[PDB]
């Protein structure tokens, strides 16, 4: 679905909750994450980290592509 | 990984919890979201909104592609 | 953004929290999920399932592509 969704998802969050913020993470993703962490609510970061962790598992669990080979035959 | 995952993720949610639902969001994404919100548990929506917010940060923080230029030289 | 993000997101989780783990879900996604579930904290799984459920809604709500046709005319 490409993008054009964060502004539509952000707005869906900017109207459902007046406390939803998305600070400009202009740094890099590891800065943008530590910034959201060092900036957003530590607890929203707690949850965001868990969101990234779930995001991580999911992608890992659903990474059927990357699969190491093994031993087909017995000997 | 394309799609073919929501039915496999939905099933992973339809078996782990008998209270997991995914109402037909036939409207548009902003209707589908307000529907999940106006339909799903406000608290599941609270969490979903936070999920969209985390989903949003992540994508924003990890959006190394979109980067505004600046001033390389001092003068 | 392709991938090269789970290791950067995992690290963002491996430094923010010393209890963040991502067990090798070498099985399939439905095994990797039931493994994270049967392995990770049931409560982290509770949240991960909710993360997959939110991940699911979002993708479904934002699936403007898949749209069944209807009746344009009245008769």
UniProtKB/Swiss-Prot annotation, chains A, B, C:
<feature type="glycosylation site" description="N-linked (GlcNAc...) asparagine">
    <location>
        <position position="3"/>
    </location>
</feature>
<protein>
    <recommendedName>
        <fullName>HLA class II histocompatibility antigen gamma chain</fullName>
    </recommendedName>
</protein>
<feature type="glycosylation site" description="O-linked (GalNAc...) threonine">
    <location>
        <position position="70"/>
    </location>
</feature>
<comment type="subunit">
    <text>Homotrimer. In the endoplasmic reticulum (ER) it forms a heterononameric MHC II-Ii complex: 3 MHC class II molecules (heterodimers of an alpha and a beta subunit) bind to the CD74 homotrimer (also known as invariant chain or HLA class II histocompatibility antigen gamma chain). In the endosomal/lysosomal system, the CD74 component undergoes sequential degradation by various proteases, including CTSS and CTSL, leaving a small fragment termed CLIP (class-II-associated invariant chain peptide) attached to the MHC class II molecule (alpha-beta-CLIP complex).</text>
</comment>
<comment type="function">
    <text>Plays a critical role in MHC class II antigen processing by stabilizing peptide-free class II alpha/beta heterodimers in a complex soon after their synthesis and directing transport of the complex from the endoplasmic reticulum to the endosomal/lysosomal system where the antigen processing and binding of antigenic peptides to MHC class II takes place. Serves as cell surface receptor for the cytokine MIF.</text>
</comment>
